[PDB]
Structures are given as C-alpha cells and as structure tokens.
Design an enzyme around this catalytic site. Sequence first.
Site, PDB file in Angstrom:
ATOM      1  N   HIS A   1       0.794  -1.158   0.135  1.00  0.00           N
ATOM      2  CA  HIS A   1       0.136  -0.119  -0.105  1.00  0.00           C
ATOM      3  C   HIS A   1       0.704   1.154   0.052  1.00  0.00           C
TER       4      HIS A   1
ATOM      5  N   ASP B   1       9.139  20.251 -27.092  1.00  0.00           N
ATOM      6  CA  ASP B   1       9.188  19.054 -26.417  1.00  0.00           C
ATOM      7  C   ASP B   1      10.499  19.209 -25.314  1.00  0.00           C
TER       8      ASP B   1
ATOM      9  N   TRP C   1       7.885   0.329   4.465  1.00  0.00           N
ATOM     10  CA  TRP C   1       8.497   0.909   3.399  1.00  0.00           C
ATOM     11  C   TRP C   1       9.963   1.415   3.813  1.00  0.00           C
TER      12      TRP C   1
ATOM     13  N   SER D   1      14.252   5.717 -12.890  1.00  0.00           N
ATOM     14  CA  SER D   1      13.330   6.548 -13.556  1.00  0.00           C
ATOM     15  C   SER D   1      13.549   8.171 -13.149  1.00  0.00           C
ATOM     16  N   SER D   2      13.338   8.297 -11.804  1.00  0.00           N
ATOM     17  CA  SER D   2      13.144   9.623 -11.103  1.00  0.00           C
ATOM     18  C   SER D   2      14.471  10.427 -11.482  1.00  0.00           C
TER      19      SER D   2
ATOM     20  N   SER E   1      -1.103  27.594  -5.890  1.00  0.00           N
ATOM     21  CA  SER E   1      -0.768  28.839  -6.156  1.00  0.00           C
ATOM     22  C   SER E   1      -1.360  29.175  -7.768  1.00  0.00           C
TER      23      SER E   1
ATOM     24  N   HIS F   1      13.883  12.282  12.687  1.00  0.00           N
ATOM     25  CA  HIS F   1      13.094  10.958  12.320  1.00  0.00           C
ATOM     26  C   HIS F   1      13.871   9.943  13.272  1.00  0.00           C
TER      27      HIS F   1
ATOM     28  N   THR G   1       6.917  28.579   5.396  1.00  0.00           N
ATOM     29  CA  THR G   1       5.794  27.873   5.033  1.00  0.00           C
ATOM     30  C   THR G   1       4.476  28.834   5.723  1.00  0.00           C
TER      31      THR G   1
ATOM     32  N   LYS H   1       3.847  31.327   2.916  1.00  0.00           N
ATOM     33  CA  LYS H   1       3.054  30.722   1.779  1.00  0.00           C
ATOM     34  C   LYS H   1       1.601  30.809   2.285  1.00  0.00           C
TER      35      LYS H   1
ATOM     36  N   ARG I   1       2.209   2.018  16.147  1.00  0.00           N
ATOM     37  CA  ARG I   1       2.086   1.527  14.662  1.00  0.00           C
ATOM     38  C   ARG I   1       2.371   0.142  14.277  1.00  0.00           C
TER      39      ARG I   1
HETATM   40  C1  HEA Z   1       3.807  16.056   2.266  1.00  0.00           C
HETATM   41  C2  HEA Z   1       4.481  15.540   3.183  1.00  0.00           C
HETATM   42  C3  HEA Z   1       4.728  16.178   4.644  1.00  0.00           C
HETATM   43  C4  HEA Z   1       4.923  17.449   4.609  1.00  0.00           C
HETATM   44  C5  HEA Z   1       5.075  18.737   3.983  1.00  0.00           C
HETATM   45  C6  HEA Z   1       5.519  17.399   6.001  1.00  0.00           C
HETATM   46  C7  HEA Z   1       6.027  18.692   6.849  1.00  0.00           C
HETATM   47  C8  HEA Z   1       6.542  18.587   8.176  1.00  0.00           C
HETATM   48  N1  HEA Z   1       6.755  17.705   9.088  1.00  0.00           N
HETATM   49 FE1  HEA Z   1       6.667  15.695   8.430  1.00  0.00          FE
HETATM   50  N2  HEA Z   1       6.338  13.761   7.974  1.00  0.00           N
HETATM   51  C9  HEA Z   1       5.905  13.094   6.934  1.00  0.00           C
HETATM   52  C10 HEA Z   1       5.552  14.031   5.571  1.00  0.00           C
HETATM   53  C11 HEA Z   1       5.284  15.193   5.614  1.00  0.00           C
HETATM   54  N3  HEA Z   1       5.927  16.134   6.669  1.00  0.00           N
HETATM   55  C12 HEA Z   1       5.801  11.483   6.722  1.00  0.00           C
HETATM   56  C13 HEA Z   1       5.306  10.684   5.599  1.00  0.00           C
HETATM   57  C14 HEA Z   1       6.387  11.286   8.205  1.00  0.00           C
HETATM   58  C15 HEA Z   1       6.582   9.809   8.750  1.00  0.00           C
HETATM   59  C16 HEA Z   1       7.438   9.016   7.951  1.00  0.00           C
HETATM   60  C17 HEA Z   1       7.501   7.573   8.874  1.00  0.00           C
HETATM   61  O1  HEA Z   1       8.315   7.786   9.857  1.00  0.00           O
HETATM   62  O2  HEA Z   1       7.044   6.613   8.241  1.00  0.00           O
HETATM   63  C18 HEA Z   1       6.529  12.569   8.827  1.00  0.00           C
HETATM   64  C19 HEA Z   1       7.071  12.504  10.343  1.00  0.00           C
HETATM   65  C20 HEA Z   1       7.314  13.767  10.803  1.00  0.00           C
HETATM   66  C21 HEA Z   1       8.260  13.894  11.903  1.00  0.00           C
HETATM   67  C22 HEA Z   1       9.275  12.940  12.545  1.00  0.00           C
HETATM   68  C23 HEA Z   1       8.298  11.979  13.561  1.00  0.00           C
HETATM   69  C24 HEA Z   1       8.432  10.857  14.107  1.00  0.00           C
HETATM   70  O3  HEA Z   1       8.540   9.986  13.145  1.00  0.00           O
HETATM   71  O4  HEA Z   1       8.486  10.773  15.463  1.00  0.00           O
HETATM   72  C25 HEA Z   1       8.540  15.274  12.280  1.00  0.00           C
HETATM   73  C26 HEA Z   1       9.380  15.572  13.362  1.00  0.00           C
HETATM   74  O5  HEA Z   1       9.698  17.141  13.552  1.00  0.00           O
HETATM   75  C27 HEA Z   1       7.803  15.932  11.258  1.00  0.00           C
HETATM   76  C28 HEA Z   1       7.543  17.452  11.108  1.00  0.00           C
HETATM   77  C29 HEA Z   1       7.280  18.204  10.139  1.00  0.00           C
HETATM   78  C30 HEA Z   1       7.159  19.706   9.883  1.00  0.00           C
HETATM   79  C31 HEA Z   1       7.739  20.617  11.429  1.00  0.00           C
HETATM   80  C32 HEA Z   1       6.657  20.195   8.766  1.00  0.00           C
HETATM   81  C33 HEA Z   1       6.422  21.535   8.404  1.00  0.00           C
HETATM   82  O6  HEA Z   1       6.884  21.447   6.968  1.00  0.00           O
HETATM   83  C34 HEA Z   1       5.171  21.908   8.578  1.00  0.00           C
HETATM   84  C35 HEA Z   1       5.109  23.360   8.695  1.00  0.00           C
HETATM   85  C36 HEA Z   1       3.680  23.856   8.875  1.00  0.00           C
HETATM   86  C37 HEA Z   1       3.133  24.788   9.524  1.00  0.00           C
HETATM   87  C38 HEA Z   1       4.245  25.693  10.342  1.00  0.00           C
HETATM   88  C39 HEA Z   1       1.769  25.131   9.553  1.00  0.00           C
HETATM   89  C40 HEA Z   1       1.446  26.322   8.343  1.00  0.00           C
HETATM   90  C41 HEA Z   1       1.994  27.671   8.672  1.00  0.00           C
HETATM   91  C42 HEA Z   1       1.236  28.546   9.439  1.00  0.00           C
HETATM   92  C43 HEA Z   1      -0.181  28.136   9.716  1.00  0.00           C
HETATM   93  C44 HEA Z   1       1.876  29.761   9.743  1.00  0.00           C
HETATM   94  C45 HEA Z   1       2.048  30.092  11.268  1.00  0.00           C
HETATM   95  C46 HEA Z   1       2.811  28.951  11.744  1.00  0.00           C
HETATM   96  C47 HEA Z   1       3.584  29.395  13.117  1.00  0.00           C
HETATM   97  C48 HEA Z   1       3.310  30.581  13.545  1.00  0.00           C
HETATM   98  C49 HEA Z   1       4.486  28.274  13.470  1.00  0.00           C
HETATM   99  N4  HEA Z   1       6.924  15.214  10.388  1.00  0.00           N
HETATM  100  C1  HEA Z   2       0.276   9.268  -1.005  1.00  0.00           C
HETATM  101  C2  HEA Z   2       0.225   8.396   0.048  1.00  0.00           C
HETATM  102  C3  HEA Z   2      -0.998   7.923   0.705  1.00  0.00           C
HETATM  103  C4  HEA Z   2      -2.229   7.705   0.526  1.00  0.00           C
HETATM  104  C5  HEA Z   2      -3.099   8.551  -0.498  1.00  0.00           C
HETATM  105  C6  HEA Z   2      -2.779   6.868   1.514  1.00  0.00           C
HETATM  106  C7  HEA Z   2      -4.063   6.674   1.632  1.00  0.00           C
HETATM  107  C8  HEA Z   2      -4.956   5.653   2.634  1.00  0.00           C
HETATM  108  N1  HEA Z   2      -4.376   5.187   3.796  1.00  0.00           N
HETATM  109 FE1  HEA Z   2      -2.285   5.158   4.087  1.00  0.00          FE
HETATM  110  N2  HEA Z   2       0.005   5.300   4.360  1.00  0.00           N
HETATM  111  C9  HEA Z   2       0.768   5.539   3.632  1.00  0.00           C
HETATM  112  C10 HEA Z   2       0.530   6.433   2.584  1.00  0.00           C
HETATM  113  C11 HEA Z   2      -0.614   6.588   1.824  1.00  0.00           C
HETATM  114  N3  HEA Z   2      -1.766   6.556   2.334  1.00  0.00           N
HETATM  115  C12 HEA Z   2       2.229   5.499   4.086  1.00  0.00           C
HETATM  116  C13 HEA Z   2       3.435   6.074   3.587  1.00  0.00           C
HETATM  117  C14 HEA Z   2       2.132   4.563   5.153  1.00  0.00           C
HETATM  118  C15 HEA Z   2       3.028   3.981   6.104  1.00  0.00           C
HETATM  119  C16 HEA Z   2       3.112   2.433   5.904  1.00  0.00           C
HETATM  120  C17 HEA Z   2       4.276   1.715   6.839  1.00  0.00           C
HETATM  121  O1  HEA Z   2       3.994   2.010   8.280  1.00  0.00           O
HETATM  122  O2  HEA Z   2       5.020   1.180   6.443  1.00  0.00           O
HETATM  123  C18 HEA Z   2       0.526   4.321   5.319  1.00  0.00           C
HETATM  124  C19 HEA Z   2       0.032   3.553   6.446  1.00  0.00           C
HETATM  125  C20 HEA Z   2      -1.495   3.428   6.348  1.00  0.00           C
HETATM  126  C21 HEA Z   2      -2.009   2.755   7.800  1.00  0.00           C
HETATM  127  C22 HEA Z   2      -1.262   2.469   9.077  1.00  0.00           C
HETATM  128  C23 HEA Z   2      -0.845   1.060   8.546  1.00  0.00           C
HETATM  129  C24 HEA Z   2       0.134   0.577   9.923  1.00  0.00           C
HETATM  130  O3  HEA Z   2       0.738   1.578  10.600  1.00  0.00           O
HETATM  131  O4  HEA Z   2      -0.042  -0.653  10.352  1.00  0.00           O
HETATM  132  C25 HEA Z   2      -3.365   3.033   7.526  1.00  0.00           C
HETATM  133  C26 HEA Z   2      -4.624   2.608   8.756  1.00  0.00           C
HETATM  134  O5  HEA Z   2      -5.700   2.984   8.290  1.00  0.00           O
HETATM  135  C27 HEA Z   2      -3.738   3.457   6.139  1.00  0.00           C
HETATM  136  C28 HEA Z   2      -5.160   3.747   5.566  1.00  0.00           C
HETATM  137  C29 HEA Z   2      -5.202   4.496   4.350  1.00  0.00           C
HETATM  138  C30 HEA Z   2      -6.596   4.767   3.654  1.00  0.00           C
HETATM  139  C31 HEA Z   2      -7.924   4.234   4.364  1.00  0.00           C
HETATM  140  C32 HEA Z   2      -6.297   5.686   2.734  1.00  0.00           C
HETATM  141  C33 HEA Z   2      -7.347   6.106   1.846  1.00  0.00           C
HETATM  142  O6  HEA Z   2      -8.805   5.502   1.959  1.00  0.00           O
HETATM  143  C34 HEA Z   2      -7.571   7.594   2.148  1.00  0.00           C
HETATM  144  C35 HEA Z   2      -8.403   8.259   1.068  1.00  0.00           C
HETATM  145  C36 HEA Z   2      -7.858   8.658  -0.442  1.00  0.00           C
HETATM  146  C37 HEA Z   2      -7.925   8.035  -1.665  1.00  0.00           C
HETATM  147  C38 HEA Z   2      -9.140   7.069  -1.660  1.00  0.00           C
HETATM  148  C39 HEA Z   2      -6.903   8.065  -2.530  1.00  0.00           C
HETATM  149  C40 HEA Z   2      -7.686   8.732  -3.594  1.00  0.00           C
HETATM  150  C41 HEA Z   2      -6.893   9.125  -4.874  1.00  0.00           C
HETATM  151  C42 HEA Z   2      -6.730   8.345  -5.892  1.00  0.00           C
HETATM  152  C43 HEA Z   2      -6.893   6.813  -5.654  1.00  0.00           C
HETATM  153  C44 HEA Z   2      -5.908   8.430  -6.808  1.00  0.00           C
HETATM  154  C45 HEA Z   2      -6.670   9.019  -8.209  1.00  0.00           C
HETATM  155  C46 HEA Z   2      -6.825  10.356  -8.129  1.00  0.00           C
HETATM  156  C47 HEA Z   2      -6.355  11.338  -8.787  1.00  0.00           C
HETATM  157  C48 HEA Z   2      -5.446  11.056  -9.798  1.00  0.00           C
HETATM  158  C49 HEA Z   2      -6.676  12.696  -8.571  1.00  0.00           C
HETATM  159  N4  HEA Z   2      -2.351   3.684   5.379  1.00  0.00           N
HETATM  160 CU   LIG Z   3      10.887  14.788   7.445  1.00  0.00          CU
END
Ligand code: HEA
Ligand code: HEA
Ligand SMILES: [Cu+2]
Lengths: 74, 98, 534, 269, 55, 36, 110
Positions: free
Chosen positions: C62, C92, C127, C157-158, C256, C291, C316, C319, C438
């Site tokens: 998944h 292109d 993963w 690919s990427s 945007s 992390h 952030t 934005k 988890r």
């Molecule tokens: C698109 C994906 C995405 C994005 C954009 C982000 C964005 C951010 N993430 Fe993360 N993150 C993940 C995907 C993402 N993340 C995933 C997948 C994991 C788990 C992976 C795994 O362990 O399996 C993860 C896990 C993760 C961890 C590790 C947690 C753990 O494993 O214990 C942390 C630690 O700090 C973190 C922090 C942040 C922060 C600070 C931002 C910042 O970019 C967010 C900043 C946003 C704001 C600040 C709010 C908007 C701003 C305002 C409203 C302005 C006002 C704000 C202030 C006054 C502060 N996220």
């Molecule tokens: C893009 C990334 C992505 C997306 C879309 C999702 C979507 C969903 N995921 Fe998650 N998930 C992960 C990334 C994502 N997930 C990752 C990285 C983990 C960690 C795995 C690990 O622990 O190893 C995780 C783990 C994770 C867990 C925890 C498993 C665990 O820790 O044991 C669960 C539990 O319910 C969950 C449920 C769901 C459900 C119900 C949806 C969806 O039902 C939510 C609704 C979204 C959709 C239905 C998709 C709609 C869009 C499309 C189908 C594409 C077509 C559309 C366009 C082209 C516009 N997934």
């Molecule tokens: Cu990170």
Amino acid sequence: PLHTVGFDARFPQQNQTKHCWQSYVDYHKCVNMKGEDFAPCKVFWKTYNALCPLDWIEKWDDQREKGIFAGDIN
Amino acid sequence: TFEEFTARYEKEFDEAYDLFEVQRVLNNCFSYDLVPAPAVIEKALRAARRVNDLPTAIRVFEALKYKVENEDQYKAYLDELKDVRQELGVPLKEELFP
Amino acid sequence: MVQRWLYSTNAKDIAVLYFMLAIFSGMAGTAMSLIIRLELAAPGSQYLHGNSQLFNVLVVGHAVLMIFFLVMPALIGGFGNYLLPLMIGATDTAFPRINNIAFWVLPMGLVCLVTSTLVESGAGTGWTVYPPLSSIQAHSGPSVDLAIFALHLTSISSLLGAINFIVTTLNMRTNGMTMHKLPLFVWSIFITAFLLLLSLPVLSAGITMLLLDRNFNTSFFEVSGGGDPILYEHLFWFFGHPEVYILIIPGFGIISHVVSTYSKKPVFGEISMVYAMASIGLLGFLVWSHHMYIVGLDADTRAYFTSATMIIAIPTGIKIFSWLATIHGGSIRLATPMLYAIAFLFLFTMGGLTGVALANASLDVAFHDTYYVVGHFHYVLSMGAIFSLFAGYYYWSPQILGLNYNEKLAQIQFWLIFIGANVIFFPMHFLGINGMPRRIPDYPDAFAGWNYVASIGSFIATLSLFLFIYILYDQLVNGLNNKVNNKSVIYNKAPDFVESNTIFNLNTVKSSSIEFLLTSPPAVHSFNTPAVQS
Amino acid sequence: MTHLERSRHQQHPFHMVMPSPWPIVVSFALLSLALSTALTMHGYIGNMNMVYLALFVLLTSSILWFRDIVAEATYLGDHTMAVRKGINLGFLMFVLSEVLIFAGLFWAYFHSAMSPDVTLGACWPPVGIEAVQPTELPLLNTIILLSSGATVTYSHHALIAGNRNKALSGLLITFWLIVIFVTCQYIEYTNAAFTISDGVYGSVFYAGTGLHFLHMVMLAAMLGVNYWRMRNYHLTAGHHVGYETTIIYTHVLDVIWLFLYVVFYWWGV
Amino acid sequence: NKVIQLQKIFQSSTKPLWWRHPRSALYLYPFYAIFAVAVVTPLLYIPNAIRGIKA
Amino acid sequence: WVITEGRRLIPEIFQWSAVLSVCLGWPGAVYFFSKA
Amino acid sequence: KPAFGPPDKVAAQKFKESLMATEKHAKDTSNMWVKISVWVALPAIALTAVNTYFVEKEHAEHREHLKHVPDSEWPRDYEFMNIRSKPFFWGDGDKTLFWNPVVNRHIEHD
Ligand code: HEA
Ligand code: HEA
Ligand SMILES: [Cu+2]
Ligand SMILES: [Ca+2]
C-alpha cells in the site's frame, strides 16, 4: 541500602557501549598486568557486571580464551 | 493622491474611442480601493453617451451603489448628479425595474 | 498502433502513459487500505485468519503503491511532462529518447513488486526497509531482493526524469521568458528536480549496500563484523526528509495557480513566494534526524535538530498567509477546483501545526511510533497532496482532453471525500495520545472505539473513488454532449462587473499562462514559431 | 535568404528525434537482469549462464543506442549550438550525481573510522588486517593518473591547433596509461591479504575503490571510441562533444582518486 | 574520409535509422534471436519459483 | 463605521462558532449518543 | 522576402577573428604541456617504476615462502574475519571473486 554506578565524566551521554567495554578491558589489565592489589580491581568488576548484558560476557570469555579477543588485556 | 487620482481619470475617460475602451476604463476606476469622487463619475457618464451605450450608463450607479458603501452617501452622489443624469436620460435600476 | 505507444518520443503521450499507470496503481493500492481497515475494525483477527504476514506485506504494498506509483508519476511524470514544456514554451523536452525510458522502467518495477509479493515469504519490513529485520537471517527468501530491485528502477526513472527537467528549464525558454519571470508551477518543478538530483544517489548507495550485505557477505550493517544498523538510518533518511518535500512542492504550484484564477486577483508577493519555496527545499536538507530522535543521539545534536526544524515554519507560514491575501479582495468563484483549494488551505495548516508539535525532541518521546504520527502525515499526504491532485485534474482536464465532467456530480464527490477522510484521519490523534503503536494488526480492546469510527469512514472514501471512476467514464463517453447541455461549467472566469456579455465573447480567456490559449486538445506540434513575451 | 526558403527548415534550434525502439529494449533487458539475478542468488536456475546472457543483451542494446547517436550527429547533423549546450549541461548534472554516490561512500567510511566499533579492535584499521601500504604500488598509480591528465590536455589542444599526429598520439598514450592503471589495480586485488568478507573494513575499502575500479574500465571504453572516431575523421577541429565530456570525465575521476588516496590509504593506517 | 559518402546514404533513405547502413542486417537479425531468449527464459522459471521447487 | 460594521460583523461570529464546533466537535456526538 | 535584416558585418570579423585567436592560444599552450610531459611526467614515472619494480620482487619471494611451510598453522580468525551468512552462488561455497589461495585460506578451527 540501594546504590549504583555514579555519573562518569567522559561518558556523560545516552550511548554507553564504550563505558561497558572499557571496564572489561580495564579489569583484566588490572589483574594480569600488575595485579599487585585486589581491592582497586573490583571497581571495574562491579561496573561491567552492571550495565552490561549477560550474553556479551560469555561471548567475550570464549573469544579471550581462544585468543581472538579484540581488546589488549596484556 | 486623491486629487492626482481624480485629475488623471478625468483625462483617461476623455480619451476612449470605442465601447471596449470605455468598459475597460470604468472597470479600472472602480477597481481601486477608494470610492471615486463625483467629478469622476460625471465624465464617465459623458463617455457612455459618446460611444452610444445605454446599459453601461445604467451600470455606473449600480457599480456606485455597491461601491459607495453608505445609504446616505449614495443619496449624496444622487443629489449632485440629478442635473446631468436627468439631462442625459439615464434611469436607475430600481426605477427601470428590469 | 505499436509505434505510437511502444516507440513514444512525444512528451504528451508519455504524460498520458504516466497518468494511465497512476490510476491503475492508485486503485490497486487503495484496496489494500480497505482490507487493512476491515482487519482493524474490531479486536481479534476478523478477516485475515491469523496471518501477521500478509498484513505487513499489504502495508508495504500500500505505501509503495501510493507513494512511488501514484503521486510520483502523476504530479511529476504526469503534470510535469505535459505542462512544463507548454508553459515554458518548448516544443518538447531536451532529451526526448530518455524520457521514454524514464517511464518504461516503471512497469518492470511493478512486475518485480508483484512477483516479490507472490513468493512464499513476502516482504513484511515496512517501506523503511531496515537492515537487521530485512537481513538474510530474518527474511530468508528472494522477496526483499525483488523489492529492492523495484526501488532501483523507480530511482533510475526519477533520476533520468530530473536531469531532463533541469536542462529543459534552463535553456529551452521562449524569446521573452527571463528566469526571473516564470510561472510558479515551473519553479516548483525546478526546485523539486534539484532536490531529487541531490537526494537519490544516497538512497541508491544505501539500498545497494543492503543488497550486497544480504548476498555478498559485506559487514555493512551486520552487528557481527562491526557494522552499524544506524548508519542505514542516516543514509535512508537523508533522502527521506527531503522526500516529504518532493511530494508537496509541486503541490504548492497547483494551489498557487488555482487560487488566482477563480479569485480574479494576482498572487500577493510572488518573489517572496519563490524565495520561500526555495528556502524550504534548501533547508530541508539540514533536518533529517528528527526521524531519529529516540535512536540515542547526543543531547546537543538534538537541540540543533529541534532548532533547525522549526525554522521550516517561517517560509511555510509565509506561503499560508500569502494565499489568504490574494483571495481577500478579489471576486471568488466557488467551483470544484476552488473547493479543493479551500479545503487544502485548512487541512494542510491543521497538519502543519501537528508537525511543529512533533518537531520538539523533548516531546517526541511521547508521540513517536504511534498513530499520532500517522494522523499527522495523513493530513499532508492524503489531504495535502491528494487534494491538489484532484484540484489539478479538475483544473486542467477539460483543456487537455477536451471533455467536460458534469459539475454537480463532481461536487458530490468532493463533499463525500471531504467528510470521509476527515472521519478516518481525525480520530487517529486520539488513538495516538493514549499510546497506540504503529504497524500492528490487532490491538488491546480499549482501543476499539475510534477504530470502528475510522473503519466506517473508509467506505465513504471508497464510494467517492468509485464515483470518480464513473465520472471518468462519463467524461470519456458522451463528454462532448456535456458542454452542449447544461451539465457542466464552460468558462473558468466570469465577466467583470462592467463587462457586457457580448465583449466577454471576444476575450474569453484572461490567463497568465500559455496553457489555456492552446487548442483543446493541444496539437502534436504546439509551437512552430516561438512565442514572444514582454 | 528568401521567405520561401526559410520556411523549409526548423524555426527552432532544438533537435526532434524519430521514434526509437531502444528505450524499451533496454527496459526489458533491465528486467531480465533484475529477474534472473534474483533467482540465481537462491538457486531456481542452477548455473550462472542466464546472468551472463542478460548482461550481454544489456550491453549490446546500449551499444546500439550509442550507435544511433553518432549517426544523427555526424551524418544527419542535428546537433546545433543550442543542442550542444544541453548535452554538456546534462553531462555536468550527471557527474554531480556520480560524485554524490561517492559522497555516500565517504560517509560510510568516516562513520566506522572516527569511532571504531567494539566488535573490532579499539583501533582502526581493525586488529589483524594488513592494510595496503600507501608508498609501495598505489603511489605508482597516483603518478600514472596525474600524467594521464597532462597527456589528454595537449591531445585536446593539438586537435584544436590542427595537427592530427600529436592529437592521435596523445589519446594512444592516454588509453594505454589508463589500461596500466587497471592492470596494476588488478595485481593488488589478487595479492591483498584481506577480502570483501573481512568484517566492515573490507566492505568500505572495496566499495570505494571497487566503484572507482569499475568506473576506470568504463573510462577506457570511452577513450577507445574517441580513437576510432578521430582516426576515421569523425571528430572535427571545432565540434567534438563526445571528446569534451571524456576530458571532463578523466579530470573529475582524478580528483576522486586523490581523495581516495588521502583517507583510505594515508589517513586509514 | 567516408563521412561524405556515408552522409549521402543516411540522408535520403526513407528507412528506420537502424536499418539505413548496408551492414546493419548483420547486427539486427542475430540480436533479436538472442534478445527473445533473454526476456522469455526468466519468465518460465516464475511459476516454478512460486511453487518452491529449486533446480 | 460602527453603525455599518455592526450589521455585518457580529452575526458572523455566531455563525463562526457553529461551523467550527461541527468540524472539531463531531466526535463528541458519537461518544455521547451511545458510548454504551 | 529578405527574411533576415541587413548583415551585421560587425559580429563578423569579431566571430572570424576569435577563431584565429582560439587556435593560436591552443597552438602554443599545447607546446607548453608537451614540455611538462617530457620534463616532469616522464622522469617521475621512471624514478617510481624502478623503485616499485625492486620492492615488488621483495614481496614476491615472501609470498612463495608461505606455501613452503604451513608449519604452525595459519593465524586464527577473529569473530569478524570470515563472514559466511549465505554461501556464494558462483562456484564452491566459500571463495570470493579474486582469491589467491597463497594468501587467502579460510581454515576452520572446530
Ligand atoms: C507531504 C508530506 C509532508 C510534509 C509537507 C511534512 C511537513 C512537516 N513535517 Fe513531517 N512527516 C511526513 C510527511 C510530511 N511532513 C511523513 C510521511 C512522516 C512519517 C514518516 C515515517 O516515519 O514513516 C513525517 C514525520 C514527521 C516527523 C518525525 C515524527 C516521528 O517519526 O517521530 C517530524 C518531526 O519533527 C515532522 C515535522 C514536520 C514539520 C515541522 C513540517 C513542516 O513543513 C510543517 C510546517 C507547517 C506549518 C508551520 C503550519 C502552516 C503555517 C502556518 C499556519 C503559519 C503559522 C505558523 C507558526 C506561527 C508556527 N513530520
Ligand atoms: C500518497 C500516500 C498515501 C495515500 C493516498 C494513503 C491513503 C490511505 N491510507 Fe495510508 N499510508 C501511507 C501513505 C498513503 N496512504 C504510508 C507512507 C504509510 C506507512 C506504511 C508503513 O507503516 O510502512 C501508510 C499507512 C497506512 C495505515 C497505518 C498502517 C500501519 O501503521 O500499520 C493505515 C491505517 O488505516 C492507512 C489507511 C489509508 C486509507 C484508508 C487511505 C485512503 O482510503 C484515504 C483516501 C484516499 C484515497 C481514496 C485516494 C484517492 C486518490 C486516488 C485513488 C488517485 C486517483 C486520483 C487522482 C489522480 C486525482 N495507510
Ligand atoms: Cu522529515
Ligand atoms: Ca480484526
């Protein structure tokens, strides 16, 4: 009546692998190399018997015996 | 400044040679934060008569009614503009009932 | 014909192929989520008999299918390949022949992944394929070897795609398009490509180290031999934290562009927007070990990583506010893309606040490896990146395909997915604060409350996806009839207040990009004589 | 130029390539290599005759890809000035990725070197390993590689100057001076006391230099195709992109060797 | 050298680029024979591996 | 400005408090209706 | 019909002289690198090849001395020395790509 090993400078952090290892090396160099006094060697002996997993001791006991101990006890 | 604003759209409207330009300038005059002065609106009415478009003259006050933001200030613009509006013939939306 | 699709060199056909592969993998990966929710609906093994395997394998499948086979080929390979040449003005891409191999190595990875799942062992490692559990003694089959080979294919690919985009942007622009005057989507793609270029090789090195250690006897991470399983964490996450920004930066360009067309006013402070977009990419390379807070680092490096990760909120936030300032004064058109953008602005800020809450190393000892983090990253992934993908599709599809999509049947899908995803992902934060870990298939009884609620909500989102598939079918079939009757909306910008209906019909599109001026569908040879700007 | 004539030509300086079957043939050759290698590692085939076949098809298909590139640049002539800048820029972005692969290998070395593991000795290199002596044989490779950068430089400028006997002689010495590096490196590998299986020390040592070793064999092949193209009057005096990217490749690959000579040989003993 | 007479042949050929040279038939025909064996033989061992029989 | 802004501002704060209480307070309904 | 405008005639004679300037700079700088090659690179290789040749033969007699007497058996292996988690697939069970039976033995002390 409870006590344990005190805070140690040079090993002030979470990771403690070297703190266990040095006590084992120090203990054997305390005895085989100039083991003129029994008392000061026991500071390490109560320090690696603590803080160290049991099975590591038997592994290091076989490697020392066989002559493949990484540490220099002599 | 406000006086510079008024004196520079007073010149823009005097140079509008088609119905696309008149509707372009009036969309610029009402796009600014300030509500335009009554001297500005009078020149806009003259422009619509010059390009022969009745419905854009009607929309001038409709634009002002939403822009003026006050129920008495719309009457304030109404009173000073009675002579020019009646002379031209522009009807208000409420009077027209469209 | 075989020549047109097997020997493709046209970038638009490769974009269509990328799109087509993304939906199939999207449906495949969203059924495993359905099975996971059905297994977690109630305490006890309900559907999968007792197999803890085939649960972790399903989770790995998944995650990989959702990340590496849906978002990557759709946002980067689908939209980036189709729209970057058109907005820049290039006919292109710079390397048209490696653009095809950037795609055709993806189906091979699917074969490697499926045959990995079908071997008797499977890959139940997550993963994040950590060495000691995915070593040869704990996973003794050829399964994770085949899983690794898929990662190499996606990485190549990427990488070959990223090299293509940097050269294309740098020296294939039109006669007036200075690097200072670019659309924001191109800027997002450019910065994303630069992040990919510098991040992929480290992942490749670590993954190949893992492969050689399993089969070539190298004490790379083997404890007996001086290896360190924590070096793998550094090597993997150096590509890992920058990665969470490759999946959202192209999601920023879409938002945007959307919020300044249905709100008839240009973006507030564009140069600050590109500065903030570049700063997030640059500074995300300095925060990777948040992390790895509880792995046993030094106290002083934890303070550094805590201080450096909070700076992320400064650009952030810029934005977030600049998006709320370009809609303040303009006239708002509440269409489906605008409804997706407005939902994104709220849900991504809800995710980011939880993210900054997670950024403190002293607090993360209570929120790490719980469903709290799952709820966090499902807001920025399933509500931050998926929503901008839906918004981009509803934004560009009638221009690309030439077929309208029955507005009122799409707003129903929007509301269904909104109130379905909010039901799945909001209760998770409640499960995480009580300490629910988890990656488990079955949980203590006291956690049965919110899990049932979250399981009910998955069916709503699945129904919305089925409705979206029907919308696709009704768009491709009799979609030319949708713009004849009154089922859809034709013009994305209504006339101004003092603009008559007969003058709007000589200037129909007032856009700031070449994309909406082209014929629908765009010609195979779009630009014979180059376009001129300023 | 008449308006009618100008319309019988491209209006842009970019090169449009005809549809080709190699992007997918290489893709299928990469699956066979990935799928056959995963089987022979655990049996399921019996002998390593399918791995060799997959490598041969992978290499042969890649040759036929490069065979097409030289045809459209030398006979059809589709490489205008704008196209030539993209190829150079694309190669510069490709060598940066190559460097960062090595950057991940230096990180693996410094992790186990600065704080050596406890299962090893308390020291580095580990107890009982006879490391390669930096002054006896590797120093010969260092002087050889530096001299390669000096003889490819005047081979490049002699080609610009206009005489082909010095340009052709510079490459011939350059090729044989790189082959000597490969054969001398082969001698040291077969005479070393430690193997890849010798704990963590052998893993990092043979992954850094081994990756460089595999890169030197691909450098000699690149040098070999420039001698064929120069001898048969392909490379001209003002247009040689397949040769400029080779000179950048050998100069960058000397800097990487100097870095591998300071930390893996000097600093690691 | 031969580049001038090779230029006149590759241009004005109305054939695929890999078939234009008169010596191309020697490489292409043996290639597709070996290529087919390369991409079909590993696919035969897939069901044998799924069952678990090791050869 | 006090007279004009009052007619539009103050009613919205009451509508404001309703919607935000729905998006955030919905799980309170499920627990009360039948935590059982 | 003229398509392009009047010829610049100034870009020409500034493009056609840079080519002459470029080939002149490559003409003499090529002679400088030839002088460096013969007078620096060639002596350096000659003074290090004769040194490596002599030291290499000293190693060679040592290597052939190992085979003559096993004597006291090969030095014992530390816990990290020979790693056999999964046997090699190419040939026998325990031999690496480059193996020199003279110096690599892998004796098992059971
Ligand atoms: C698109 C994906 C995405 C994005 C954009 C982000 C964005 C951010 N993430 Fe993360 N993150 C993940 C995907 C993402 N993340 C995933 C997948 C994991 C788990 C992976 C795994 O362990 O399996 C993860 C896990 C993760 C961890 C590790 C947690 C753990 O494993 O214990 C942390 C630690 O700090 C973190 C922090 C942040 C922060 C600070 C931002 C910042 O970019 C967010 C900043 C946003 C704001 C600040 C709010 C908007 C701003 C305002 C409203 C302005 C006002 C704000 C202030 C006054 C502060 N996220
Ligand atoms: C893009 C990334 C992505 C997306 C879309 C999702 C979507 C969903 N995921 Fe998650 N998930 C992960 C990334 C994502 N997930 C990752 C990285 C983990 C960690 C795995 C690990 O622990 O190893 C995780 C783990 C994770 C867990 C925890 C498993 C665990 O820790 O044991 C669960 C539990 O319910 C969950 C449920 C769901 C459900 C119900 C949806 C969806 O039902 C939510 C609704 C979204 C959709 C239905 C998709 C709609 C869009 C499309 C189908 C594409 C077509 C559309 C366009 C082209 C516009 N997934
Ligand atoms: Cu990170
Ligand atoms: Ca269950």
